[PDB]
Design a protein around this ligand. Sequence first.
Ligand SMILES: [Ca+2]
Length: 108
Amino acid sequence: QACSRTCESQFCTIAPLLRYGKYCGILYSGCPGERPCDALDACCMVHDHCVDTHNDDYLNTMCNENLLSCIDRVSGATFPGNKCNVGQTASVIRGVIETAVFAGKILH
Ligand SMILES: [Ca+2]
């Protein structure tokens, strides 16, 4: 219930408040079985489930580095009504994940 079935495009350039697609955003995720909204959204869906299936470790290196690889290869159409620039938003996301990767190496 506490999940998204709609493709959002909100606070595109503000990482703490960003909500993009059904999956991209902090503590913001699509409901079970929900199709991602575009290529960027699909990267975020995989990442979200990866963290979920690794004891909620948002600093997991696999999860995080896999998202970076995925982000760098994002292309194609986006969903209707998208207020965000896809490339600019992927960059915003990438910065957050870079920070998480660095945080993980500090702690581990
Ligand atoms: Ca999310």
